[model samples]
Target: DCHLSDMLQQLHSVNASKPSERGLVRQEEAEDPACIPIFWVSKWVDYSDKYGLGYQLCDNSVGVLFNDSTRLILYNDGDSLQYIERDGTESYLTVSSHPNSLMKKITLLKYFRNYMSEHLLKAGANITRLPYLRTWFRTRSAIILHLSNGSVQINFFQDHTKLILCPLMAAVTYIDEKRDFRTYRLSLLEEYGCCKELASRLRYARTMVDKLLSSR
Candidate 1:
């Protein structure tokens, strides 16, 4: 239901550019094939037993979906914030926005915000580009977060590894056991230049991506 199929050629386009040359669209206006929004989860925390799940999107958007089922997101590095109540109604405003009844949730959101900003380092770099979590599933092997932008990010529990499959960029950004980020073109990967650990996970991602896409 989201974006796909516009510039399939760019799938192989990443193979030409250097990884350092990835964020070319920034700095100037030279233009590149990856002119689409490719946001995905860069880092996350699980405190659902206490509060909610906190995630920082690659674009610096920090969101917390609470235990009571409300959601709060900080955009523009916390300059602006959006709140979705339990009713599923949404509202957006500056951080100074009213907390008439959301005082507790707002407080917790900012707490996690400060905590994440202070302790947790970002996962993927802006080599490309909320990455609002649309849905997620837990396999015995790993935890997967499916983003609204057609990205499938799977975090393996065994080795603390994560693989982010951004369909638009045709890239897979993976975080190894030691938590280092290295993104590669799946097309390049479909060839023979990659690791078995990562490839094996991509195999799982492909299966899930298919399963997720097949639904509405």
Candidate 2:
């Protein structure tokens, strides 16, 4: 479990390093460095060989910038362009809305795809765009799926499904970077039927991938 007091203390320390705020927090107002929480001292690991370790951090929501370099990552949160610098300072390039919702995975997927695409288009070189291929690559590496025929599998890899179907699968799983903030565990699809069901799927998929590769 995370220590609330320790987290609060860290936040305070980060805030103290910044200039004082003159008024209450408002959406329309610029991003106050003093208000941004500093809780990104962690890394994300991928167990599958298909995808390796990656970096992640979250304050209000999860942000997966890049695996290499400590440069600033900027993205539009709907209403504005929010940025997180290498030094851990966050500012707004423009005002925008990065609304958070608790919709089912499918609905959330559509929203996130549109949202990230918009920011990628606007950001140009300021951000590492999450293209469909990268999205499938990331999700396939992490997500484990189960089938009705008592078969288990990990989707998102090359042979598991065609590239054409990946975006659709992504949509069903409601694959969104921001929504899965701090979520480092298995999700709904991962738990399809139960432990037994998921186990069988993973085991078979692993075998299939290994066999296919050894033959090549």
Candidate 3:
């Protein structure tokens, strides 16, 4: 039997920030509750100058701000962020796959969380000073990788990053499991953002489905 105590210990250790070789904590310092990380920021357009980041706690999720008005909600999953843009004229609700890159998504999320911590520290919010880390540490090896060396990697929910694409995959899969239809649909929606391209893709998918059913 899997010992519950051991399992709990392991789970706690998974996302715990550990000391690095330099004896410095690997997790970001949470000094100010208001600090936010802005990585890969361009000089031509500074995020600080344009949209100062903030934090807001909401029901069902934690909100990360990009200025005073624009904010994204991080669901319990921690990997998904619902981007809600209510600009009066161009109001839309969307989802973004953060840590969505070629590298290990799980590792990417850890880095992202750490980056967030670092930002907090810079902003005078030291997480180490808190009675305990407030954020829930999620442990899951839920990562799928289409490697470049002709190898496919599968990390279950227990080992991969919490931002694992499993939920996203499942949601997309509901559209069409075969012929990569779900991927096509998601790509179209993400790229076009509810534009005419979305309708076009849906139509194409429907036609393909009809032909597939007819062949049967």
Candidate 4:
């Protein structure tokens, strides 16, 4: 019931040769489909140096992947958030209410979310909330964000590019430097759709996905 797992494997098997090996979407590709997760980074600001990386999901929930490696989430126009951790450590609070510790955090969340809303165009869709930051690590060129419900998002600093992989949906969404959003199904990489630059990043993302799936 996971097409992304199969897609990654098929892509890896076919991605062995040189650039000439790039082919159109396979004609004979199929996998079990199931309930799809509904989350992707719609807008984000890389402010980890001063505060943290702030992002708005498709669900409009704002989150900060902090420099201290903690995460705070606040649902837009709602009262809900906490120091949400993957280890079951979280206290729900509304944006209108939080402990004193989050006084500045809520301000920061509001500021970043507003900034993103005013300055950035959304990268993808708006769906019901079903994603939360699980773990993230920064590379030299980008920050990798793995969320709950089997979705991964990578934000590249070099050119304001980003990648979102939703395993349950068996799909990929790529946001380019020009801020264009493109979605491609797992087995349907258009002949001229997937570029070599993204192809390179996809390798790392797929490996991360593979590791996550293996553990599951």
Instruction: Write model 3 residue lDDT over 7-58, tens digit each, in one string.
Output: 2232222213221222332122211222221111100111335543323221
Model 1, residue 2: C-alpha shift (Å) = 4.5
Cα distance off (Å), candidate 3, residue 7: 46
- Full-model lDDT, candidate 2: 0.27
Candidate 4 Cα lDDT to native: 0.66
Q: How far is 49's C-alpha from truth in model 3 (Å)?
A: 2.0
Error of 3 at 193 (Å): 54
User: How much lDDT does each candidate structure score?
Assistant: 0.64, 0.27, 0.26, 0.66
In candidate 3, position 46 carries an lDDT of: 16
lDDT score for candidate 1 against the true structure: 0.64
What candidate 4 gets wrong by more than 4 Å, as runs, is 1-11, 17-37, 125-129, 137-141, 156-161, 175-182, 185-201, 207-216
Report the alpha-carbon TM-score of model 1 versus the true structure.
0.67
Native-to-model Cα distance after best TM-score fit, residue 205 in candidate 1, in Å: 1.3
lDDT of 2 at 146: 22
Q: What is the C-alpha RMSD of each candidate to the true structure, in Å?
A: 7.8, 20.8, 24.0, 5.3
Off by over 4 Å in 3: 1-47, 56-62, 87-113, 119-216
Candidate 1 residue spans exceeding 4 A from truth: 1-38, 67-70, 84-90, 125-129, 178-180, 210-216
